[PDB]
Write a protein that binds this ligand. Structure first.
Ligand SMILES: Nc1ncnc2c1ncn2[C@@H]1O[C@H](COP(=O)(O)OP(=O)(O)OP(=O)(O)O)[C@@H](O)[C@H]1O
Ligand SMILES: Nc1ncnc2c1ncn2[C@@H]1O[C@H](COP(=O)(O)OP(=O)(O)O)[C@@H](O)[C@H]1O
Ligand SMILES: [Mg+2]
Ligand SMILES: [Mg+2]
Lengths: 469, 50, 517, 345, 348, 50
């Protein structure tokens, strides 16, 4: 025939040989068979490279344990395709488009390739409309853009998953469109938790979940983001209504790309990443976008390796975002939640013309106070607080109360504290922090600012501690 | 500013409508020539006037 | 209405005149392909850096040449490359169209418009790797390039023909500095004088598409797209595009420079070009060095930045000013590419996040920032009123430890402390609001002449603002003769001092107090 | 701003429909090209045109392909050159079964030398005095062979080599040389070439059996075992020399592709006479007047005497395409249609 | 006949194949031709390695854009040769000896190979000696060595070029000597500035400028110091004249060596510099010495990466330096010229 | 989650040497009986703040 033959199997990378004139195009999906009775399955290999002399280097999307040299490889003649349409809402899918809670569902839908080009430059338009969440620190210092790109940068286990569940609860529960969740290389326990949580919150009927977890080979973790992104792109281009796109740990995409890079025969770059780090990240991220008239509010959790924000992967992801909420382990260690670093977090719509001048002035004063406090902290640690000015002692008191008032009891944290969460409008946040920076609460203790909502809860917890306001 | 920008907004809106009205009238009135010039290149590629 | 038969007869024009006789070509064959690189057997006559044509209009660049194959960098649509395809030879090294039709457009790193406003009428073509002006083809940098930013234009002046690096961590305001430098040339463009007009080229390397869209929107709302081209290599483009983008932007604007015109060029994030070239060189299996950079990356940047020159009078006298942008990590200016570009350029502007958070915006560290051209890139008025400024701020920075003990300081020390606080509040500046050089002269006159010692430090900005407002409405003659004579003679200083005193007795502070001496 | 914007969109799709009419008109032109492609008269009445345009464009100083020598690096080029012309000296002295048994000898000489690479290394080490190595090879196989073979085998490992298997394919080069010199003695040198080229066409577009003659892990005879099976399936492969040649390469393929190996041998065949080979694609077979003009002019262009090969394919839709060395002259109407399509405004 | 031909071109690194009896020496200068009329030029390759099979690996001193495989490569039979004599005074050259202000000047001078050995051991001066310049601060607090090396740590706007002109004048008048200025990794703007400043101060007739600029591949930025050193060596040995050699940013010589080493595929040493860092700095600095009553004194600008004086490049450079002159800006603002920091300078 | 143990906290007498500022469990109160979940509700945040 014109089918191939396995030649080399070194982990998740498989070389295949085809007859002359029957070499499959790049990114095609090939089928091979594993016949060992306990591990019998069908391998899907994605063509990665043309090696020459009719050899073709591919990446398997399933574990190759049990694969034999010389077995037949069938060329499907097209890339990996996933189902698309209004029928994927309410279901869980593989990285390959196989429904998980109902195997065989979606076999008859329209199928779309998971490899597409980003929208052309003429359809791109800046988005500068604020998306109000209800969190104090987010609404004040990093206002989210509606139809723009948002990220939660964080080290290992700071707040990323809890905050992204909080944003699913806040933005998506009363949302007038379609949500897509891509868990890219994350824990399966968390995936099941999110499935059940969306099922009980009646958000599942509007969501399409796509799961490729950490137990999967690097091919699945390379392509699951593309599968979910293809579903979202269908919802944006054809149906055209207000897509939300959550991506838990888009860093796993880059990590999986780096796990197979040398096996594909590429010299490694600086920190052991593939030489094609920035360009692969740009080919993926430029598709996660909103065109003129068609909106995709994107939100991605971004793992920061070893709490190092200079690592090439987060350093490259930084350039693709409109609002970045950067969580810190120095803030996690103090018990402040969400553990947002206010001096590193950013937004493009924190502008006098977009959010108004009062919002901007209050945010700038908060940031200035917190920066001065950070500058004083070491002097305070060594020489004691009594060696400062009275100007500076006043500033330090205000700054500690501000650092504590930025924390909040979130709805998705009731499992870690037992205390239900709260919502604070943006005007109440602006007024509250204006009063804080002016000094109206210098008498209330440091606590009673810790894990509360607006100003009335501040009053309640202050009287619970013996103070006015 | 907003008077100007809303003006230009719906300006280009029903402008766009007139754009399409021109467009698909021309889309057909440009077919009677599919013959003529095709002939030209059909010989210009062949080297004989036919 | 639309030009209908104009359309159909334009294309009949194209085809009837379709002549492509059977020329003999020298072809090769793709033997392997992966990650954006293709190896081509054959092509005995292909030269280094030559453009190759793959099937489907795909383009590549012959980088590696050896006895077996030719390693070429695919310039987009790489997923259509297969082993066994036929590669045709062009006979031409990389070149781009150049001309005046490029003003107001957004183009590929190939001269192809990506904004969709039609094709770009091209004067000529120009090769990407044409040599820089000779050491004797140049002239001392003497004319100023006004950025409209008080900190830069007073402390680290930029000349016409100078390479000024803008280096900072991230979200520090580098793109804002360069966009304001671009917007400040609006009034020089309105003057219609070819010896004062500055054409701008904004190279965007590896940026998100909507970011380039926002930069273009900011340049349009400021009316700066009549004299600005954007060479955009978005983050979705290939590594070859990001590597070639600044060379395309520098090939444009060298046509102008050699035509006797004055150009400014902004290479936004040369770090991303360095990383694209590192990707290319690692995929071609070239020896890696420190941080895996190929070993000619210093050459990659210095060959680009030495084409920014000030030509002599027998070459027209044109100039090309460079503003390369470098993004550091954790303020590590001792990294590899930061070290290279600091070595190359004529001066540096270090932007910092700690200054940005303290409210110092633009966050230019005036202690470490430098300009090796210096006072030669300034007008007389600014060279006078701002020669006092550097050591004022030095004294203030070495005195601000005693901010809580001004009672214990000498008279001159407390004087320096107050003057330094005022001057620091003076160099602050909003975004997208550049000031002409006469208003900067007047503001720094306010600062260094002592006319701010009566105003609260939390009132300087507004004060200065309002004063300039007043001077723009009432006493325009001072600004006018500063602009025309480039010097603030003593009589203009007298009239300016009296204007300041009158405005003072009219001005009301925020605490309610007075500002009169 | 709006005045600019709606004009931009005007320009946008006006360009859209512009190029759309262009493309559909050019493939309508293709539809017309077909009704003109129907009859044979105009097919050759355009190949004549193409051959005239060829009459107008000479010359170029192309090189002759020494097939294996082009694969050589330095100091193997020298060895192979003077050894093959030393065999040019030797081949004068023999007769028919003389050099057919020189084949039979030398081919299994190569077989052994390939399968035991260990002593191949030792007879390959380019130390100066060959005498220990000539003693090695003759002490090995003197009582195995006739005199001329170990003669030029001494001559073979005498010269230094740049690689290891370079010498085994040097001795196979001289094997071929011998057999084709015999075919020359028989006056059969045109027929051997046409047999080899037609069999090339026979084999490569039938790759499923072509790859079959490729499993080197199979004992070597096994492949030719099948090969003779198909070849004298009918022996209008009317020559036996062709059988011996392709038999000996099937003997020593060493993982090479048969699909290109046999044409490599057809080309060393044609190069032995000293003429470059050109490969031509057409839509229908040509006259010998067209063949005369073709061979005539392309010989004028490349400044060397030439022979032609044909691969008829209607899909190229008239005209001609020639490939020589690694350069090309395409005048097929198909490529011209593709060009007209690819250069639309 | 006896000429080679290009085989591989990967950046500035060109492999050339020669006939069997015509393999060129190491460091020989070969001449290839780029005929594409946009970039038409004559590449000067420098043999660096013998790869076997008659292949040699060379580093091109010009950019290799437009080079074709198989083009003829002519062997000159010698290393890079620079023109020597007194006629090289008042003119600007590059690392190859081509006159930049007057192209074609010096083609008829005697030419000297830039790869020379330091003086023989029996010819070295065993006793160190002070170079009396005439400046009070230098003669008192930082006595320069005659035939020694002096680091110069002057930044921008501290009168460093004025001190260069001053040393030029003093060596040309107090010692009847000459000056050679090596601009290693020299910015073309500052090169033209220095040219016109020396022409205006009328000390160009006393100086030979040799510029290896920044827009050139690492080969010339590596060899320009040796070009200027060869000119100075002619002035000392053959003319019998004390010389003063200004090597501005010796660190760029080190960096160009590192880049050439990375291009040639050698494994990087500690930090990243070339494995032969100390040997390169030694072969350069050992030629700047006193010989038979005549001298070559050097004033060298040094860059300290990350202000780390333990960095391999300044730790290797300082093994050869004899004095240090730090030009302070605080002293310059006081109107004290030369603005030599007295407490921060030093001499051995 | 993780239970990060330290040698400094170990030598100070804190045994187990769990560093409560960085230690965490991602299951939380679901991994506790109701009594302990109500009693030790905000213990980790209280100790981090302390
Ligand atoms: N002079 C200024 N005054 C106030 N805000 C400013 C000023 N300059 C910049 N900013 C703000 O700082 C933010 C970052 O600015 P900018 O995008 O110019 O930095 P950047 O160097 O481009 O960072 P990155 O390249 O990482 O995006 C912007 O949102 C802008 O609003
Ligand atoms: N707002 C919060 N309140 C209380 N605990 C929190 C909060 N946010 C995070 N945590 C704790 O941090 C742990 C890890 O958070 P998570 O966001 O899952 O980490 P990661 O960012 O690595 O996914 C959780 O188990 C939870 O106990
Ligand atoms: Mg997580
Ligand atoms: Mg920017």
């Amino acid at each position: 025939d014109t089918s191939g033959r396995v030649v080399r199997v070194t982990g998740p990378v498989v070389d295949v040989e085809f007859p002359r004139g029957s070499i499959p195009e790049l990114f095609n999906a090939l089928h091979a068979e594993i016949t060992f009775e306990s591990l019998a399955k069908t391998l899907t290999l994605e063509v990665a490279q043309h090696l020459g002399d009719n050899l073709v280097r591919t990446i398997s999307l399933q574990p190759t344990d049990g694969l034999v040299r010389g077995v037949e490889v069938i060329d499907t003649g097209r890339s990996i395709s996933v189902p698309v349409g209004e029928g994927v809402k309410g279901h869980v899918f593989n990285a390959l488009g196989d429904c998980l809670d109902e195997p065989g569902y979606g076999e008859k839908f329209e199928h779309w390739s998971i490899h597409r080009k980003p929208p052309a430059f003429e359809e791109l338009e800046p988005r500068t409309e604020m998306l109000e969440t209800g969190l104090k620190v987010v609404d004040l210092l990093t206002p989210y853009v509606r139809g723009g790109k948002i990220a939660l940068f964080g080290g290992a286990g700071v707040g990323k998953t809890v905050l992204i569940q909080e944003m699913i609860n806040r933005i998506a529960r009363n949302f007038g469109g379609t949500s897509v969740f891509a868990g890219v290389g994350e824990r399966t326990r968390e995936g099941n938790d999110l499935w059940v949580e969306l099922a009980e919150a009646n958000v599942l009927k509007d969501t399409a979940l796509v799961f490729g977890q950490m137990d999967e080979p690097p091919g699945t973790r390379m392509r699951v983001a593309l599968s979910a992104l293809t579903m979202a792109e269908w919802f944006r281009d054809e149906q055209g209504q207000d897509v939300l796109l959550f991506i838990d740990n888009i860093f796993r995409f880059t990590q999986a790309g780096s796990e197979v890079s040398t096996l594909l025969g590429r010299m490694p770059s600086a920190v052991g990443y593939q030489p094609t780090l920035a360009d692969e990240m740009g080919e993926l991220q430029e598709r996660i976008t909103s065109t003129r008239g068609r909106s995709i509010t994107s939100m991605q959790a971004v793992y920061v390796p070893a709490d190092d924000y200079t690592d090439p992967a987060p350093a490259t992801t930084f350039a693709h975002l409109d609002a970045t909420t950067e969580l810190s382990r120095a803030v996690f260690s103090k018990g402040i939640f969400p553990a947002v670093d206010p001096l590193a977090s950013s937004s493009t719509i924190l502008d006098p013309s977009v959010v108004g001048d009062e919002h901007y002035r209050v945010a700038q004063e908060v940031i200035r106070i917190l920066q001065r406090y950070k500058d004083l902290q070491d002097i305070i640690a060594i020489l004691g607080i009594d060696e400062l000015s009275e100007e500076d002692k006043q500033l330090v008191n205000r700054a500690r109360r501000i650092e504590r008032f930025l924390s909040q009891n979130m709805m998705a944290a009731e499992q870690f504290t037992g205390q239900p969460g709260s919502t604070v409008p943006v005007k109440e946040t602006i007024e509250a922090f204006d009063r804080l920076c002016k000094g109206d609460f210098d008498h209330v203790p440091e606590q009673a600012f810790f894990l509360i909502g607006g100003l009335d809860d501040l009053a309640k917890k202050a009287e619970s501690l013996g103070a006015k306001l | 500013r907003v008077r100007a920008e809303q003006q230009v907004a719906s300006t280009l809106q029903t402008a766009h409508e007139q754009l399409k009205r021109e467009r698909d009238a021309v889309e057909l009135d440009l077919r009677a020539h599919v013959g003529t010039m095709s002939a030209t290149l059909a010989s210009r590629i062949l080297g004989v006037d036919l | 209405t639309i030009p209908a038969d104009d359309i159909q007869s334009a294309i009949e024009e194209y085809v009837s005149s379709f002549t492509a006789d059977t020329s003999r070509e020298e072809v090769g064959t793709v033997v392997d392909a992966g990650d954006g690189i293709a190896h081509v057997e054959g092509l005995p006559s292909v030269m280094t850096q030559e453009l190759l044509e793959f099937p489907g209009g795909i383009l590549g660049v012959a980088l590696n040449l050896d006895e077996h194959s030719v390693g070429a960098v695919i310039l987009g649509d790489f997923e259509n490359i297969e082993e066994g395809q036929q590669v045709k030879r062009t006979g031409e090294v990389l070149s781009v169209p150049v001309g005046d039709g490029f003003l107001g457009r957004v183009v590929n790193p190939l001269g192809q418009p990506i904004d969709g406003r039609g094709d770009v009428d091209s004067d000529t073509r120009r090769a990407l790797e044409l040599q820089a002006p000779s050491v004797v083809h140049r002239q001392g940098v003497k004319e100023p390039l006004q950025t409209g930013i008080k900190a830069i234009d007073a402390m680290t002046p930029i000349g016409r023909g100078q390479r000024q690096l803008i280096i900072g961590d991230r979200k520090t305001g580098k793109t804002a500095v360069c966009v304001d430098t671009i917007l400040n040339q609006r009034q020089n463009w309105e003057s219609g004088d070819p010896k004062k007009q500055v054409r701008c080229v904004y190279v965007a390397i590896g940026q998100k598409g909507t970011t380039i869209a926002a930069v273009r929107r900011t340049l349009e709302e400021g009316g700066a797209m009549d004299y600005t081209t954007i060479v955009a290599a978005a983050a979705s483009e290939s590594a070859g595009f990001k590597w070639l983008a600044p060379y395309t932007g520098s090939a444009i604007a060298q046509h102008w420079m050699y035509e006797g015109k004055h150009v400014l060029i902004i290479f936004d994030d040369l770090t991303k070009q360095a990383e694209a070239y590192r990707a290319i060189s690692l995929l071609l299996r070239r020896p890696p060095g420190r941080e895996a950079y190929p070993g000619d990356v210093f050459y990659l940047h210095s060959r680009l930045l030495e084409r920014c020159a000030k030509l002599s009078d027998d070459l027209g006298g044109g100039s090309l000013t460079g503003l390369p942008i470098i993004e550091t990590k954790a303020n590590d200016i001792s990294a590899y590419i930061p070290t290279n570009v600091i070595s190359i350029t004529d001066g540096q502007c270090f932007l910092e996040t700690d200054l940005f958070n303290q409210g110092v915006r633009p966050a230019i560290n005036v202690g470490v920032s430098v300009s090796r051209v210096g006072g030669a890139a300034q007008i007389k008025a600014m060279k006078e009123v701002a020669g006092s400024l550097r050591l004022d701020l030095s004294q203030y920075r070495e005195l601000e430890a005693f901010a809580a003990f001004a009672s214990d300081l000498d008279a001159a020390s407390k004087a320096q402390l107050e003057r330094g606080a005022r001057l620091v509040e003076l160099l602050k500046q909003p975004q997208s609001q550049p000031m002409p050089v006469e208003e900067q002269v007047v503001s720094i006159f306010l600062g260094t002449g002592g006319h701010l010692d009566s105003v609260p430090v939390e009132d300087v900005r507004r004060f200065e603002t309002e004063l300039l407002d007043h001077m723009r409405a009432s006493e325009e003659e001072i600004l006018t003769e500063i602009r025309d004579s480039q010097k603030l003679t003593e009589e203009a200083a007298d009239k300016l001092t009296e204007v300041i005193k009158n405005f003072k007795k009219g001005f009301a502070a925020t605490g309610g107090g007075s500002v009169v001496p | 701003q709006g005045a600019r914007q709606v004009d931009l969109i005007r320009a946008q799709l006006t360009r859209q429909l512009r190029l759309e009419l262009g493309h559909e008109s050019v493939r309508q032109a293709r539809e017309l090209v077909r009704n003109h492609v129907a009859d044979q008269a105009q097919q050759s009445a355009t190949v004549d045109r193409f051959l005239d345009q060829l009459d107008a464009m000479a010359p170029a100083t192309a090189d002759v392909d020494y097939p294996l020598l082009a694969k050589m690096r330095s100091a193997s080029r020298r060895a192979l050159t003077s050894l093959v012309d030393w065999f040019g000296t030797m081949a004068q002295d023999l007769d028919h079964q003389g050099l057919t048994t020189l084949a039979g000898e030398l081919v299994s000489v190569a077989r052994l030398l390939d399968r035991e690479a260990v002593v191949t290394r030792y007879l390959t080490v380019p130390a100066e005095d060959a005498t220990p190595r000539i003693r090695l090879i003759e002490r090995l196989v003197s009582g195995k062979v006739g005199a001329p073979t170990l003669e030029v085998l001494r001559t073979a490992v005498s010269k230094r080599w740049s690689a290891n298997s370079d010498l085994i394919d040097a001795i196979e080069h001289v094997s071929r040389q011998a057999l084709l010199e015999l075919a020359e003695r028989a006056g059969q040198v045109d027929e051997v070439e046409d047999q080899l080229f037609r069999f090339s066409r026979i084999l490569d577009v039938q790759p499923r059996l072509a790859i079959l003659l490729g499993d080197c892990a199979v004992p070597a005879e096994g492949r030719v075992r099948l090969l003779r099976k198909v070849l004298e399936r009918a022996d209008s492969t009317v020559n036996p020399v062709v059988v011996a040649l392709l038999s000996h390469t099937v003997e020593l393929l060493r993982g090479q592709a048969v699909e290109e190996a046999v044409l490599f041998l057809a080309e060393v065949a044609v190069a032995r006479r000293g003429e470059i080979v050109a490969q031509v694609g057409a839509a229908a077979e040509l006259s010998d007047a067209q063949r005369t003009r073709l061979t005539e002019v392309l010989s004028r262009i490349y400044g060397h005497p030439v022979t032609v090969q044909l691969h008829i394919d209607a899909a190229l839709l008239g005209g001609l395409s020639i490939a020589v060395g690694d350069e090309v002259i395409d005048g097929t109407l198909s490529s011209r249609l593709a060009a007209a399509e690819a250069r639309l405004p």
